[PDB]
Design a protein around this ligand. Structure first.
Ligand SMILES: O=C(O)[C@@](O)(COP(=O)(O)O)[C@H](O)[C@H](O)COP(=O)(O)O
Ligand SMILES: O=C(O)[C@@](O)(COP(=O)(O)O)[C@H](O)[C@H](O)COP(=O)(O)O
Ligand SMILES: [Mg+2]
Ligand SMILES: [Mg+2]
Ligand SMILES: [Mg+2]
Lengths: 138, 472, 472, 138, 246, 138
């Protein structure tokens, strides 16, 4: 499948040129920029692994590109995303999150249907790769 | 023995009764209301404003001595300013102040019972419209505010940086539960974040509610497994009695739905009851403003929708339909901008052009997600982003299901159009002007969008707005 | 593969989609609605009527193939007749028919979600007013109707042959529970049948609800023992949530109150829930139509009150305010007569002058007692009996409490005036013309009435009605 | 006290002339006319004693006057009322009820206040004369 | 309805015999009734079985099997190709087999058969009991175990049937009615009540299945009169036809 | 196993000649004809993938045969079924559904028995092939 989590995942995978322009957007909005990664892309997997510590006052986009490329080099068969956080009072949350690296092939998800009361079903979605240990995925 | 003073029996005008006071200093705890008053020929505007203030607070048509048994001077509402409406000699803007103690804490019903209770049918006033209200910090804190709120909603969905996309299932009435689920699966798999029941889909001879809930949840979970996204469908829990609504809401809860929807037509007490339920049960609550335009369409009488936006953000709703400027339903760009600000902002600044007559702090109550729906299609995407912004749910019913190549294709067209547009916005391109070209460029890679752009190319809804600004 | 016919993708006008059919034969099971349509300049009236019919039933702005998965031809609503409004070239009366299967049984919310849901904010229609509806026998039987109803109410009170007399306590806001009970005792002992909370009296800093309920019931029972009559006070159970309303209603039940009241502003689902509660707990349910004139005042847009009268008689309310012709609130004699007929009669006959556009059988649902309140006083008694008739609750707030010699004296004045007037009516005297003299004659024996007649002698409310007939 | 049950009890006690005119009203509306009496005027005493059987098709008011006067002669120290019933489908109830005879002096009612939970009271209204046996009242 | 129509008149001395043949129930009265909890169309959608009759089987011997053995028969019949198997109408809770064992063992058999065929399978668990509370207990346990269907016997009576029809609608359960006791009044042409009347009353009440006869089986069923019964149960509008007794 | 979902699955797999006769039946009943497919044959998998859009006014059976064969060519190791829908008011549902293509070998289903209260079990039926990702089934 193509995992369509992330702000731009129905578009082609962004080139470094396109990523740089998005980082300029994040810098103009004074966002803290974080790089996160996982090989468990369950929609409800709220906490991907953080690559270091979020870059807080960023003036130069190249610093962020360097870290994205460093993460890609160390975690090639992982999903990597860039997150932009706003500390402004009404928000205090992520305002942009997009995928910058995908493994070569995504298997997809298994859907478990447990029969419960009458026609009610309890569902479990589980990625096929997460039936393999972490070190053996993708 | 009989009285002899201001409290002796008889009829004296409302202005003489204490409801007109141009020197009143607005206390920060006062509820302020702005009315557009058209008095009858012969009625002095000041007397009409005083009449509105009097009958929405403590007065009746004749003097009653029992006022003396209360701190009457404090409880009387005071009209403190009357201005004439810019290009209309018959209409006046009357500013009225009401003491905090007159209202029941946390109750929209009690607030409305005073403000819109009887004064709109008062013979002396030919027309009357409630335009805006300043709800004080101390009153606002007795309300829950949105159950989830925009920020938490996006965190539960893991969707940030772009508008969310929805779709009302069509035909409005007539599909079975099984077929409703078909449409839901196709649209969500194709790329929409949400699909919804139409406001009048509840439980009817052609489809009762339990089938629709069961089949829809199967479709939602299949779509989620097919995309890797959190998906949802607004299950409509609107029903005749509170017990029946609770039954529907609780079944949706049992099945793991992330969202439910209600219609304004259930009324304020039922809405407040469901807002509390949603907060207590981690459910996103969508409000469809059914019946709203029965009173908000005409400039001379009724209630302007920004007032309903304030009352519903207070009540606790998470989404409310706030209009599309370019769609099939009424929406003047400047007045619609005011609505969106009311729902999304932490503090409102007075802006006469938008009809925001008062500065208002929102007491850190959560933000309501505006929903833009009705007669819109890809192609309008660049101006939808331009007028409505980032935090909005863009709903394409006909704009998805009406696509010739199928529902999945309709959904993809809309999703690709959205993403390409905010990508361009983020790249600092003048997307308003370059919009047709941005879409055309994305269409080269996505056949579904190309066909959507060709199909609805010339569909526009150019009509004169009824609810317009007075300061343009 | 792609479609090629009436269901191929594209936008075609609503009239071509099947929503305009001048040859449709109205089935006895159809819900019929009459709309006053003002189309935008350039929109053909037939297309506007078809647009209203389409969007209140099954259509959307573009063709959707999914219609084919339903019995589309049956579910489409059909506008079947468009006539021009007698002295207005811009307005049209459009008759639309809706199939029974489109509606949920027993639900006002579902009915309104289709009929007034979205069409009033449709850009192509400049203004739109719902005038009347024919609700079919088979649909009407799924509704409870009045919990008590006029006939049973009078049997529980042992009061027949004359209007009932009530009084709203004044000042509207500010009295304590203790003082509220004082006013109730005095007015009931003096001769009123009922006294009531004002619509905005719920539970506030100056008086919370439990005190008012306890002190009022003491006053009601003292008055009953002092007169030998069944007495009552409308305890207002309006509250923010359903649970809070139930708490108030159940405490009133525990104390033995014969009646409670709710405000329209709580909304339709809360009203239906309370109507069922009242039937199950032998409680008279009074509805105050708070917020009604926000949409019913203007002839060109909103909803005419006779529609709300039908929906509320269906919902199950026992009393609803239906206007005084001669009071401080709007009420044209001919249009008000239509309202009273809607509430009281077993079968309605089409009468264009009253705005009753359809014949309608009421399926033997019980009668709602109309309440006439606002700015009325003894002196107007002869025309109150003449316009409003026998089955009505005449409420004198200011007309009782504003009396110089005290509240008991105010109540007596009103009671003696009423009885003398219907005695004269029953004696076949022309009470309309002889009215001032009948009152003057009764005043010779009752000083309280003499003073009331002198005090309010010249008080009249001569203003031009906004909601008027089109056939006069 | 003066018991104000009945349609015209805030007015003076009606003369036979006035009663005759009210019976004409009942006859024009084709009402069944009933005469009822009691010496227990509790507001909730729904069933007063019937004086005979309701007069159904009445053409002459004098027939009803005769029975009212016969009842007054036999039950002088009783409350007597005239009731008019309509058999029409939406109604099927009493549409007029007025007192035509009152005892010379009415004591009034006792109010009993039984303390229940918290400040709630259960009330009993009882006419003072109904503390005497039926044959000894008024 | 029945308290007026069949209340006392059948024992009236002046009438030697009396039979209720048919009734026209008006649109306005019909709308105050729920109708079938599931109904044919939704039932087939929940089972994913269309275009052919459904096949069932009453477990035999009628009385005497244990819970364990009842489940054996259910498994074998469902795996072999039947869509449904059922309790016999007089199998409720008795010394040889109480109800909880039968429900537990049957559901094991139903799910094994489903996994063995790739079909939705079911067994009509009979919730007939002496009191309403006991019926609710049995129905709710069937609900808890995920049974797609339950069955009741006409002999519980009209109020219990209506109460269970509402329960079935609210709990997504197919409700099968076995017309036990019906032929006590419907067999003879001169007295009693013709079964098409019971078909109307039960379609109104809300039952999802009712036994309507086989023409060629061991129980009474004239082809023309049986056709009338089937039309009453299945059609949206009934047309007067004197030959069928409509 | 042999999956016996579908109207004729206890009979041999229908020849194109037999399918054509069934399509004639659907055409005489004015049914909309749909072709659906999946590689998750769980009994409760209510929504198989649609092959295009349902053919609505079909006059010639060969058009439907063409699409069945096109689907078989593109989805050879999938379950494919033909569905006939009736828009008639009392029905508005599928009135026939039969399998026209089966993969070469069907593994069957796993039955999970989770112990719950007392002797109650919650069951999960899951096809063995659906433990493999979608692209690797059959
Ligand atoms: O019923 C409708 O017409 C819609 O489903 C839109 O359908 P389409 O997407 O197919 O046009 C929405 O409820 C309206 O937008 C409500 O109006 P508003 O948003 O102004 O409240
Ligand atoms: O608040 C008021 O103004 C009243 O209490 C009347 O007081 P007075 O008797 O002292 O005037 C009533 O609620 C209005 O009649 C409601 O209007 P409508 O009856 O038109 O619904
Ligand atoms: Mg809608
Ligand atoms: Mg009032
Ligand atoms: Mg058997």
């Amino acid at each position: 499948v193509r995992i369509t989590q992330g702000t731009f995942s129905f578009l082609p995978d962004l080139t470094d040129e396109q990523i740089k322009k998005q980082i300029d957007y994040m810098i103009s909005k004074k966002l803290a920029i974080g790089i996160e990664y996982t090989n468990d892309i369950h929609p409800r997997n709220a906490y991907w692994e953080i690559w270091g510590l979020p870059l807080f006052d960023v003036t130069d986009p190249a610093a962020v590109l360097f870290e994205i490329n460093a993460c890609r080099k160390a975690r090639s068969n992982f999903y990597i995303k860039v997150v932009g956080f706003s500390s402004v009072r009404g928000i205090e949350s992520t305002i942009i999150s997009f995928i910058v690296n995908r493994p070569k092939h995504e298997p997809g998800f298994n859907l478990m249907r447990q029969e419960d009361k009458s026609r009610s079903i309890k569902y479990t979605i589980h990625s096929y790769e997460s039936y393999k240990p972490e070190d053996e995925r993708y | 023995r009989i009285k002899n003073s201001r409290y002796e029996s008889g009829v004296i005008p409302y202005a003489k009764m204490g409801y007109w006071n141009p020197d009143y200093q607005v206390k920060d705890t006062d509820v302020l209301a702005l009315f557009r008053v058209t008095p009858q020929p012969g009625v002095d505007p000041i007397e009409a404003a005083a009449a509105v203030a009097g009958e929405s607070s403590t007065a009746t048509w004749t003097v009653v001595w029992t006022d003396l048994l209360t701190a009457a001077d404090l409880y009387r509402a005071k009209a403190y300013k009357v201005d004439q409406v810019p290009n209309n000699p018959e209409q006046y803007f009357a500013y009225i102040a009401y003491e905090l103690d007159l209202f029941e804490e946390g109750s929209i019903a009690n607030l409305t019972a005073s403000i819109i209770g009887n004064v709109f049918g008062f013979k002396a006033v030919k027309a009357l419209r409630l335009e805006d209200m300043r709800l004080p910090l101390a009153y606002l804190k007795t309300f829950q505010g949105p159950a989830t709120g925009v920020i938490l909603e996006r965190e539960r969905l893991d969707k940030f940086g772009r508008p969310l996309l929805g779709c009302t299932t069509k035909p409005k009435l007539g599909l079975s539960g099984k077929n409703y689920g078909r449409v839901v699966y196709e649209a969500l798999k194709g790329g929409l974040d949400f699909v919804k029941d139409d406001e009048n889909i509840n439980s009817q001879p052609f489809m009762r509610w339990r089938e629709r809930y069961l089949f829809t949840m199967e479709a939602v979970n299949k779509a989620s497994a097919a995309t890797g996204e959190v998906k949802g469908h607004y299950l409509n829990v609107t029903a005749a009695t509170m017990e029946e609504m609770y039954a529907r809401a609780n079944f949706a809860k049992e099945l793991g739905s992330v969202i439910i929807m209600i219609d304004l037509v259930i009324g304020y007490t039922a809405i407040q009851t469901m807002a509390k339920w949603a907060r207590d049960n981690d459910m996103i609550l969508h409000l469809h403003r059914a019946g709203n335009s029965t009173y908000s369409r005409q400039k001379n009488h009724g209630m302007n929708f920004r007032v309903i936006c304030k009352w519903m953000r207070m009540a606790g709703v998470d989404h409310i339909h706030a209009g599309t400027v370019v769609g099939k339903l009424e929406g003047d760009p400047i007045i619609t901008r005011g609505f969106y600000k009311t729902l999304l902002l932490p503090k409102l600044e007075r802006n006469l052009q938008e009809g925001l007559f008062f500065d208002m702090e929102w007491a850190s109550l959560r933000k309501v997600m505006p929903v833009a729906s009705g007669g819109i299609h890809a192609g309008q995407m660049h101006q939808l982003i331009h007028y409505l912004g980032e935090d909005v749910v863009l709903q394409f019913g006909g704009g998805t299901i009406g696509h010739p190549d199928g529902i999945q294709a309709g959904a993809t067209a809309n999703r690709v159009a959205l993403e390409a547009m905010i990508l361009a916005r983020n790249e600092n391109r003048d997307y308003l002007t370059e919009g047709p070209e941005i879409l055309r460029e994305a269409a080269k890679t996505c056949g579904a969008l190309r066909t959507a752009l060709d199909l609805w190319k010339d569909i526009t809804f150019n009509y004169t707005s009824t609810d317009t600004s007075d300061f343009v």
